């Protein structure tokens, strides 16, 4: 006895833990993002039709590409079926059983595990939710319910009915029965036997193929455009009624569940067996900076290495996401994927308000927990060397590798006033008291960090990062949080890997540091391995900036090239 049930996701959303539930990113052919599960857009598929077919694209993809278990099923991502013996849970106005979020109790009480689902499907042909009555909604019957639909047009359903009549004359009585009935299964959520699934699939999609030739939309909006999926809900009933009229059919109606709070529990998988994982975070307004950075990474990439680039994007435009991927198209050793950074607000929480993008670095050990090591780099940078050699630096059981922050070194030396929830104090005292660093001199800059993810997973560093995030607001936000949590667990990278470009004036601050540090800064400027445009004067704005040619070099011959001229003509 084998069961495989598929859940349809369109954004980062919690996954069920049972191995028999397979999540699918439906409509992935139209998405530039990853959500942590395979898409419906591999092999023989109709993923691009998801705006119109809805979850039928998952149905189609499983039908054409999956090795079918003895039972094949489909559920929504926040709406599932109750497979447990207790079918007496409190239901509401719509007949659904509500549960706050997807947790271990949710999967236990609703029987969302292999053992409970297997006993529920024992000698049953089809499992599905309870019928819903159209007479309460004011409709006379199921046919009239389609016609009165706010976003429905009966001519589309009439066209589908004629096709069933022509292609399958033996269904005419089943069509009449459903259309004149006052109830039915208004759902695409079911579990049915392998042989019934194949027969229904061949039957349903033969009708839908002809339906595409028989109807034409008339300025349909997003809801009306789902006409195909809406029609398939009626065909589902016509098909079942025909099976019941022919002979036996054992149907088990189950309760429906609803999850009121969306969460995210997934993770990104590596795309190569061995690669240099590079993590960048920016919104649409910094997409130009991210393009130059990614182009700089490609230009200094080792031909014999692979590069797994993941952008934690905050509403980057579809155009910019397309342009960014197009930078990697000619390079099979360079992958670029996008993840909605805003999923981090609902992973383990601080119920105060905070920006997922502002604190994105804190979530690297969780999202990338399947990686051994990962290199984060600020988006306002360009590299002058292979980022892969950062992966070769021996880390031991240190949590991170990073560059010592010489700007903070100046803040401590010159008694710059800090600002946080603990008041206002010199930066040196702030580092010792608030950040609990016995040596404030070990403060590292967060513009480039090699995460020892494997060690963070063993120590559950992520839970500590969240705890520190909850406790108070810090002067330099996640940079302060990571300096506190990673203290005495930091490998120090040479200054060549994080060279400040100096803003408009580089001679005002750095020459007044410790002489040895100033010498290290002067030597690093002469052969940088990464240039950090940290500050107010960005190269995509003024041109009158140190290392400005290094930025232009990587933005020339990209779609952002002509943007820089207008964006610079103040």
Q: Per rule CB under 5 A, is residue 557 in the interface with Mg ion? A: yes
Cβ-based nearer residue to a copy of itself, 53 or 197: 53
Q: Which of 422, 564, 415, 389 is nearest to 494 (CA)?
A: 389
- The residues, any chain, with a CB within 8 Å of residue 393's CB and separated by 6 or more, are 401, 450, 491, 493
d(CA 245, CA 115): 32
The 8 Å CB, 24+ separation contacts for 481-485 are 481/359, 481/362, 482/361, 482/362, 482/400, 482/446, 482/449, 483/431, 483/435, 483/437, 483/443, 483/444, 484/434, 484/435, 484/436, 484/437, 485/399, 485/461
Under a CB-based contact definition with an 8 Å cutoff, are residues 493 and 387 in contact? no
Which H or E run contains 95? none
Cβ-based nearer residue to Mg ion, 50 or 379: 379
User: Is residue 229 classed exposed, middle or buried when 0-12, 13-18 and 19+ CB atoms within 10 A define those classes?
Assistant: buried
Cβ-based nearer residue to a copy of itself, 352 or 569: 569
Which partner from the list a copy of itself, Mg ion, none does 512 bind, CB cut-off 5 to 8 Å by kind?
Answer: a copy of itself
Q: Is 532 annotated as a binding residue?
A: yes
CB of 358 to Mg ion, least distance (A): 13
d(CA 235, CA 229): 10
Which partner from the list a copy of itself, Mg ion, none does 137 bind, CB cut-off 5 to 8 Å by kind?
Answer: none
Q: Per rule CB under 5 A, is residue 534 in the interface with Mg ion? A: yes
Cβ-based nearer residue to Mg ion, 290 or 428: 290
Which partner from the list a copy of itself, Mg ion, none does 515 bind, CB cut-off 5 to 8 Å by kind?
Answer: a copy of itself
Buried b (16+ CB within 10 A) or exposed e, 185-221: bbbbbbbbbeebbeebbebbbebbebbeeebeeeebe
Spell out, one character per residue from 368 to 397, where the chain touches Mg ion: x when CB under 5 A holds, - when not.
----------x-x-----------------
| Residue list 434-463, contact with Mg ion (CB under 5 A) | 447
> What is the chain's alpha carbon radius of gyration, rounded to the nearest angstrom?
29
d(CA 354, CA 429): 26
CB of 534 to Mg ion, least distance (A): 4
* Helix, strand, or coil (residue 351): coil
Cβ-based nearer residue to a copy of itself, 50 or 342: 50
Binding site for a copy of itself (CB under 8 A): 29, 48-49, 52, 211-220, 322-323, 326, 413, 511-516, 518-519, 522-523, 526, 543, 549, 552-553, 556-557, 559, 561-562, 564-565
CB of 294 to Mg ion, least distance (A): 15
Q: Which two tokens stand for residue 250?
A: 């054992």
Cβ-based nearer residue to Mg ion, 275 or 448: 448
Q: Is 421 annotated as a binding residue?
A: no
CB of 219 to a copy of itself, least distance (A): 6
Cβ-based nearer residue to a copy of itself, 276 or 324: 324
Which partner from the list a copy of itself, Mg ion, none does 212 bind, CB cut-off 5 to 8 Å by kind?
Answer: a copy of itself
436: phi > 0 → left, psi -120 to 50 → alpha, else beta; which?
left
CB of 406 to a copy of itself, least distance (A): 12
CB of 478 to a copy of itself, least distance (A): 30
Instruction: Residue 439: count other Cβ atoms within 10 Å of its Cβ.
Output: 10
Cβ-based nearer residue to a copy of itself, 90 or 219: 219
Which partner from the list Mg ion, a copy of itself, none does 216 bind, CB cut-off 5 to 8 Å by kind?
Answer: a copy of itself
CB of 50 to Mg ion, least distance (A): 32
Distances (CA, A) of 69 to 21, 23, 239, 254: 12, 16, 21, 21
CB of 179 to a copy of itself, least distance (A): 22
Which partner from the list Mg ion, a copy of itself, none does 94 bind, CB cut-off 5 to 8 Å by kind?
Answer: none
Which H or E run contains 228? helix 227-246
Annotated binding site for Mg(2+): 378, 380, 532, 557
| Interaction site with Mg ion (CB under 5 A) | 378, 380, 447, 534, 557
């Amino acid at each position: 006895n084998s069961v495989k049930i598929y859940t349809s996701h369109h954004k980062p959303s919690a996954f069920l833990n049972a191995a028999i539930i397979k999540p699918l990113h439906v409509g992935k052919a139209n998405s530039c993002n990853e959500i942590g599960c395979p898409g419906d857009d591999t092999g023989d598929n109709i993923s691009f039709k998801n705006p119109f077919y809805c979850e039928l694209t998952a149905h189609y993809w499983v039908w054409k590409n999956e090795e079918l278990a003895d039972y094949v099923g489909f559920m929504h991502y926040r709406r599932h079926l109750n497979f447990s013996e207790k079918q007496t849970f409190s239901e509401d106005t719509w007949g659904v059983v509500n549960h706050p979020c997807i947790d271990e109790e949710y999967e236990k009480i609703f029987g969302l595990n292999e053992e409970t689902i297997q006993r529920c499907v024992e000698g049953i042909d089809i499992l599905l939710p309870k019928k819903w009555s159209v007479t309460a909604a004011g409709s006379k019957n199921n046919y009239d319910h389609y016609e009165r639909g706010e976003y429905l047009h009966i001519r589309d359903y009439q066209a589908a009915i004629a096709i069933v009549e022509k292609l399958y004359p033996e269904y005419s009585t089943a069509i009449k029965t459903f259309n004149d009935a006052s109830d039915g299964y208004y759902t695409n959520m079911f579990v049915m036997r392998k042989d019934i699934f194949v027969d229904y699939s061949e039957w349903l999609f033969s009708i839908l193929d002809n339906l595409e030739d028989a109807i034409s939309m008339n300025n349909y909006n997003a809801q009306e455009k789902r006409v195909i999926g809406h029609i398939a809900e009626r065909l589902f009933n016509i098909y079942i009624i025909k099976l019941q009229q022919d002979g036996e059919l054992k149907v088990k109606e189950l309760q429906r569940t609803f999850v009121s709070n969306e969460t995210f529990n997934g993770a990104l998988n590596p795309v190569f067996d061995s690669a240099v994982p590079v993590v960048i975070s920016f919104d649409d307004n910094y997409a130009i900076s991210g393009g130059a950075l990614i182009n700089s990474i490609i230009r200094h990439a080792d031909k014999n290495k692979n590069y797994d680039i993941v952008v934690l994007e905050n509403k980057v435009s579809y155009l910019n996401k397309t342009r960014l991927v197009n930078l990697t198209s000619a390079h099979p050793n360079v992958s670029l994927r996008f993840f909605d950074v805003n999923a981090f607000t609902e992973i383990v929480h601080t119920r105060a308000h905070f920006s997922a993008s502002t604190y994105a670095r804190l979530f690297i050990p969780q999202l990338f927990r399947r990686y051994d090591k990962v290199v984060f780099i600020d988006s306002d940078t360009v590299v002058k060397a292979d980022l892969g050699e950062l992966l070769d630096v021996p880390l031991g059981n240190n949590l991170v590798a990073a560059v010592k922050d010489i700007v903070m070194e100046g803040f401590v030396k010159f008694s710059a006033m800090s600002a946080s929830d603990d008041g206002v104090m010199p930066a040196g005292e702030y580092l010792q008291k608030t950040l609990n660093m016995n040596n404030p001199d070990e403060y590292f800059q967060a513009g480039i960090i090699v995460f020892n993810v494997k060690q963070m997973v063993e120590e559950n560093t992520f839970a500590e990062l969240m705890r520190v995030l909850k406790a108070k607001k810090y002067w330099f936000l996640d940079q302060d949080i990571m300096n506190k949590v990673f203290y005495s667990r930091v490998t120090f990278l040479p200054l060549e890997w994080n060279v400040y470009h100096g803003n408009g004036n580089t001679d005002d601050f750095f020459p007044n540091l410790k002489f040895a540090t100033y010498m290290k800064f002067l030597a690093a400027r002469k052969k940088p391995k990464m240039i950090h445009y940290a500050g107010e004067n960005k190269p995509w704005n003024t041109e009158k900036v140190d290392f400005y040619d290094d930025f232009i070099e990587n933005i020339a011959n990209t779609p952002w090239e002509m943007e820089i001229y207008k964006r610079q003509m103040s």
